[PDB]
Amino acid sequence: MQIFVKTLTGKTITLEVEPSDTIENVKAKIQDKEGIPPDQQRLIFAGKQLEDGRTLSDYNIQKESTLHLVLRLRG
Amino acid sequence: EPDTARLDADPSASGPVMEFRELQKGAYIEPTGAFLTRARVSSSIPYPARAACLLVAVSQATGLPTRTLWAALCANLPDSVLDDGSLATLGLTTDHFAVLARIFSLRCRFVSEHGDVELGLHDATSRFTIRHTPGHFELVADNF
């Protein structure tokens, strides 16, 4: 299936995923297209902070839904 | 859920795991404060001088003492979030800043090697810009 990822700038990215893809898998898919390492990736769905070890289905994240990508910086 | 588990294991934490956004409501600029945390009187983690470059930058832009900024974090975050095990090695995060913004009414545009992110409160009393490079925070005028 396909889901969308929307960045702070409003850009819309499209990923191909399966319901059992983990949030870590999603971050890797985003890295392939955006070049942002998973360390600097925070993903939000319906206001909830998604965690790496869970799957899209664990959050009931269904086809053609939108995730929100945000930078997390450390130093 | 590594974030939830690390908070549930924290002995300095109380209550259910929730986003800081919800634990301390305020005029957040989306998505400021959208990170999982738990409620705590005050942490005893001493001021991490060698790794407080984030607090130095905020201090320089606002005039708030660095140790005033730290005390605020120690009084509002559980030990697991103040020190995930890499406090001395990797320092502080934009989540720590989201807490300072809520307490002191700050807004900061972070300019990073991998894009920008704007965090803080809407009608903030202090507005500045901080630049991020791999492992470093530095106050700037308004880069890029």
Residue numbers in the entry:
A (entry chain B): 1 to 75
B (entry chain A): 7 to 46, 49 to 152
Passage from the reporting paper:
Maize rayado fino virus (MRFV) is the type member of the genus Marafivirus within the family Tymoviridae. The polyprotein characteristically contains four nonstructural domains that comprise the viral replicase (methyltransferase, protease (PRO), helicase (HEL), and RNA-dependent RNA polymerase (RdRp)) as well as the major structural coat protein (CP) for genome packing. The main function of PRO is to act as a polyprotein processor, but it has been shown to have auxiliary function as a ubiquitin (Ub) hydrolase to aid in bypassing the host innate immune system by removing Ub from the RdRp, preventing its degradation by the Ub proteasome. X-ray structures of MRFV PRO alone and bound to Ub reveal unique structural characteristics that differ from TYMV PRO and notable conformational changes that occur in response to Ub substrate.
MRFV PRO was covalently linked to Ub. Specifically, Ub-3Br is a suicide substrate of deubiquitinating enzymes that is a modified form of WT Ub in that its C-terminus is modified to harbor a reactive C-terminal tail, which can irreversibly bind to the active site cysteines of DUBs through a covalent linkage. The covalently linked protein complex was crystalized in space group I4. The C-terminal tail of Ub nestles deep into the active site channel of PRO and numerous additional interactions of the enzyme with the beta-grasp fold of Ub. Two of these features are essential in how PRO recognizes Ub, which are the hydrophobic Ile44 and Ile36 patches. Hydrophobic residues P37 and A40 of the long loop connecting ⍺1 and ⍺2 grip against the hydrophobic Ile44 patch. Although not hydrophobic, R27 is a key residue for stabilizing Ub binding at this region because its guanidino group hydrogen bonds with Ub’s main-chain carbonyl group of G47. R27 is clearly important in MRFV PRO recognition of Ub and could be a factor that we can attribute into MRFV and OBDV lacking the ability to recognize and subsequently process Ub-K63 chains. Interestingly, in the presence of Ub, the C-terminal tail of MRFV PRO adopts a conformation highly similar to the GPP flap of TYMV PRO (unliganded and liganded) as there now is a turn following β5, which allows for the formation of a 4-stranded β-sheet and a more canonical, rigid active site. Furthermore, MRFV PRO forms a much more extensive interaction with Ub than TYMV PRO, with a complex formation significance score (CSS) of 1.000 (scale being 0–1) as determined from the PISA server.
